[PDB]
Amino acid sequence: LHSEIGRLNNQSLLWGPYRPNIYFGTRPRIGKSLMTGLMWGKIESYTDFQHTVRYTCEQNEGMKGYGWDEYDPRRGGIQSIHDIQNGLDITTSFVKIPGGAHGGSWAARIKGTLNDDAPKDQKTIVVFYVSQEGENSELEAVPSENEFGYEGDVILKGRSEALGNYKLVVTKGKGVIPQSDHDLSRLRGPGQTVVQSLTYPDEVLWQAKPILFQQLKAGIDWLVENKYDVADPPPPWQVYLLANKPGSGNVHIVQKVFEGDFEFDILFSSESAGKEVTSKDLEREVKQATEVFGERFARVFDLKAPFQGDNYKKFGKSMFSNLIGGIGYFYGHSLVDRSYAPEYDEENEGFWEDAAEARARHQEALEGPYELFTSIPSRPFFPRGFLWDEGFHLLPIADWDIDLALEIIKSWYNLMDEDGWIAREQILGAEARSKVPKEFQTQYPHYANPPTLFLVLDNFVERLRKLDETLSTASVDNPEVGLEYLRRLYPLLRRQFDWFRKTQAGDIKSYDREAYSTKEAYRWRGRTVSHCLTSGLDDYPRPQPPHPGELHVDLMSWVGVMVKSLISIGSLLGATEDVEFYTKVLDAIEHNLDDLHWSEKEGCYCDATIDEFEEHKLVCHKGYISLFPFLTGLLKPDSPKLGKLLALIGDESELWSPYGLRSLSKKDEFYGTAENYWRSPVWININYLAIVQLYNIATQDGPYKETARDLYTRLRKNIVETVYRNWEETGFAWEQYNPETGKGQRTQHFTGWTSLVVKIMSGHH
Numbered sequence: 211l212h213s214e215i216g217r218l219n220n221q222s223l224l225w226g227p228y229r230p231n232i233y234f235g236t237r238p239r240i241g242k243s244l245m246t247g248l249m250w251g252k253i254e255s256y257t258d259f260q261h262t263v264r265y266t267c268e269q270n271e272g273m274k275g276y277g278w279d280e281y282d283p284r285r286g287g288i289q290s291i292h293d294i295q296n297g298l299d300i301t302t303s304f305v306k307i308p309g310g311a312h313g314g315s316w317a318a319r320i321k322g323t324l325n326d327d328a329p330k331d332q333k334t335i336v337v338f339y340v341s342q343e344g345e346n347s348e349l350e351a352v353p354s355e356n357e358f359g360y361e362g363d364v365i366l367k368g369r370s371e372a373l374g375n376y377k378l379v380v381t382k383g384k385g386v387i388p389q390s391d392h393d394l395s396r397l398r399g400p401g402q403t404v405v406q407s408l409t410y411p412d413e414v415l416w417q418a419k420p421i422l423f424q425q426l427k428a429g430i431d432w433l434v435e436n437k438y439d440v441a442d443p444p445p446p447w448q449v450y451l452l453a454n455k456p457g458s459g460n461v462h463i464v465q466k467v468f469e470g471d472f473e474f475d476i477l478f479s480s481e482s483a484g485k486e487v488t489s490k491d492l493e494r495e496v497k498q499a500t501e502v503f504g505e506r507f508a509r510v511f512d513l514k515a516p517f518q519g520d521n522y523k524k525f526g527k528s529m530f531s532n533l534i535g536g537i538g539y540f541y542g543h544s545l546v547d548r549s550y551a552p553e554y555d556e557e558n559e560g561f562w563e564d565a566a567e568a569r570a571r572h573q574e575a576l577e578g579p580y581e582l583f584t585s586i587p588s589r590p591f592f593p594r595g596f597l598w599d600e601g602f603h604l605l606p607i608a609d610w611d612i613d614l615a616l617e618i619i620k621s622w623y624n625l626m627d628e629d630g631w632i633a634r635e636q637i638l639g640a641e642a643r644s645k646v647p648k649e650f651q652t653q654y655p656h657y658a659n660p661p662t663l664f665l666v667l668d669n670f671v672e673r674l675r676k677l678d679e680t681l682s683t684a685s686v687d688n689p690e691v692g693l694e695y696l697r698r699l700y701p702l703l704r705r706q707f708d709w710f711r712k713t714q715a716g717d718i719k720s721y722d723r724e725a726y727s728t729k730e731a732y733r734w735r736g737r738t739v740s741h742c743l744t745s746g747l748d749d750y751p752r753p754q755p756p757h758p759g760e761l762h763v764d765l766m767s768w769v770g771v772m773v774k775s776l777i778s779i780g781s782l783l784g785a786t787e788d789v790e791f792y793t794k795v796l797d798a799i800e801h802n803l804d805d806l807h808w809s810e811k812e813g814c815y816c817d818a819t820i821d822e823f824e825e826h827k828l829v830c831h832k833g834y835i836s837l838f839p840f841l842t843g844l845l846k847p848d849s850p851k852l853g854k855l856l857a858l859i860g861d862e863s864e865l866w867s868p869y870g871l872r873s874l875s876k877k878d879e880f881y882g883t884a885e886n887y888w889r890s891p892v893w894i895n896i897n898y899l900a901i902v903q904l905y906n907i908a909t910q911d912g913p914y915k916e917t918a919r920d921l922y923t924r925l926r927k928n929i930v931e932t933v934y935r936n937w938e939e940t941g942f943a944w945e946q947y948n949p950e951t952g953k954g955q956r957t958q959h960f961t962g963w964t965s966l967v968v969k970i971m972s973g974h975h
């Protein structure tokens with residue numbers, strides 16, 4: 211029965227607009243298959259369209275904003291694009307229609323409305339770009355009746371092993387189509403929809419912009435060769451209208467020019483299903499997906515006081531939809547240094563210079579191919595899987611659709627190599643690589659990242675203990691399906707635990723260091739003089755200089771998170787021997803957090819190193835790192851140390867700002883220095899952990915119940931209100947928030963863990 215829910219999940223999730231790196235396109239969860247993408251741009255001159263055309267996501271002065279207003283990957287949703295440069299408000303509606311054997315059908319409506327500033331007679335070029343990879347697959351544009359292009363719909367008929375037979379239609383659409391009275395119209399037509407059907411080697415089909423432009427350039431070269439010149443030039447929009455040439459190929463460019471507002475549909479009909487998809491179907495499924503979305507939101511994300519108002523519902527729906535709507539399917543090779551150069555062991559003083567040398571051997575090579583199905587932090591700046599981000603992303607996604615979340619967990623865990631490593635940053639294929647400088651592509655088998663995916667697993671387990679609708683919860687409603695999922699995953703969880711202990715081990719035994727356990731001590735590999743990228747907190751201050759004797763309290767706390775999870779999951783599976791090992795490890799981490807990291811003088815946890823004199827020294831920098839045993843859920847509710855942590859947390863002169871907790875204390879010497887990334891700003895993911903733990907202390911008998919109740923109340927309010935005020939003013943979720951001014955800063959469109967705000971509002975953890 212487990213493989214039955216599995217098959218249904220596969221069929222459910224196969225199609226989506228799973229190309230979040232571009233404004234709008236679709237792809238199935240298959241490496242080498244059919245992909246679509248949208249392009250549009252005003253044209254006012256002979257040279258402007260190369261500058262105005264839109265395709266890959268960005269964020270700059272010329273784009274007011276864009277994002278999903280509703281989305282569910284099983285059903286589809288609606289996206290809104292507000293484009294200032296091109297004077298256009300665009301809506302892209304996407305809907306899926308189950309049926310047949312190949313993952314069903316789908317349809318999209320693209321609607322453009324000029325805004326108030328645009329010339330009422332703007333010419334906008336619109337391209338629908340279609341490609342198909344596969345040796346034994348075919349795709350053909352049925353030619354038109356008319357001489358120079360299409361008066362009606364463009365039908366592409368295709369076939370592959372993965373999709374069977376299918377037709378993809380681009381409807382004629384509604385809006386004024388400009389007409390040219392130039393002589394050229396005797397050879398190119400007066401103006402109409404055109405199709406060019408092309409073939410290029412499979413591996414470059416993703417390069418839609420250059421492919422389109424090479425065709426535009428050939429058209430213009432043709433003008434020049436044939437005596438169309440500046441004495442009497444055709445209008446720009448006709449100079450940039452491709453000559454119609456439909457056929458078979460692995461690339462099909464469908465181009466329309468509109469004057470004023472426009473709209474058109476794309477209808478993908480899987481042959482193996484009922485009759486084909488119509489526009490009437492598209493409109494009905496769109497209306498239906500909205501109603502379903504509406505009803506699930508109010509059940510799953512029931513906003514509590516004081517955020518019950520409609521302004522907050524709208525806010526929550528926006529933050530949620532952007533998060534779950536950034537889900538992508540990525541496919542290809544990634545770049546990995548598999549030398550395991552000994553310099554990566556970081557065993558000597560000055561290790562960062564040795565590691566630099568090894569990186570300068572450039573032994574890295576492409577490997578795979580791999581696939582990943584994942585949500586991402588940032589459509590415009592970094593639209594790809596990040597390992598510890600994904601644990602935060604899936605917390606609200608799991609509320610929505612636990613089965614989808616498990617799908618994504620599985621996807622990540624299928625990347626893990628034989629040692630237990632998953633690369634923290636998943637740049638899969640040439641398309642992904644295109645948006646990343648070559649110096650930053652290389653992954654390193656010694657670099658960890660927080661295991662925040664265990665958090666999602668913990669939520670799943672509590673739920674397991676305590677048709678699209680049915681599927682979304684099938685793995686908790688069918689407990690046998692649940693445990694079977696854990697059974698297959700568990701060995702990989704254990705592999706990653708062991709990997710952490712073998713690769714990120716700190717050194718107790720070799721210094722004058724005393725502690726309850728000889729074993730439990732951890733140090734993030736990969737640190738530079740000013741950074742510790744693998745920890746997730748890039749530039750939070752760490753012992754200076756970095757040192758093989760360093761110990762990092764956040765890392766030990768992450769290991770504590772892992773054992774606690776393995777206890778739970780081991781128990782469910784009766785891995786009795788495993789469970790007793792985990793038990794001794796937990797107990798040991800509990801003692802060693804105190805013996806190695808607790809500072810009585812400072813009243814918080816600290817990283818540690820070793821002295822010029824070879825002695826253990828705590829290095830205290832009050833901020834997120836200091837609270838880690840608390841944030842990761844490792845302290846007993848009655849703990850005196852917890853009490854001191856709550857005092858530091860609430861202290862306005864240290865961490866507590868009107869806008870959330872500061873990443874670093876105002877009192878720290880590194881406050882607001884250098885790039886100031888994690889050295890003062892408020893970050894939603896860590897604030898979210900704080901909120902969850904305050905709520906935990908707050909809803910149990912103990913000495914800190916009422917303190918935590920008050921802190922919980924206020925921090926929930928501060929964090930929610932700050933992210934809401936910024937969203938109201940700017941339309942954006944931001945990467946972090948300024949603790950002096952409350953302003954969002956760094957990167958926009960960070961959905962992204964900022965969207966945790968939906969779970970914070972809906973409460974009852």
Ligand SMILES: Cc1nc2cc(-c3ncccn3)ccc2n1CCCCCCN1C[C@H](O)[C@@H](O)[C@H](O)[C@H]1CO
Nearest residue numbers: 587591592596598599646647650745746747748956957
């Ligand atoms: C190559 C690159 N080009 C970039 C361009 C712009 C940019 N900005 C404004 C305007 C224009 N351009 C910005 C950044 C750019 N990058 C770096 C990519 C990695 C950043 C990771 C963010 N984040 C850092 C967190 O500390 C970490 O915890 C977390 O896991 C991670 C993933 O969310």
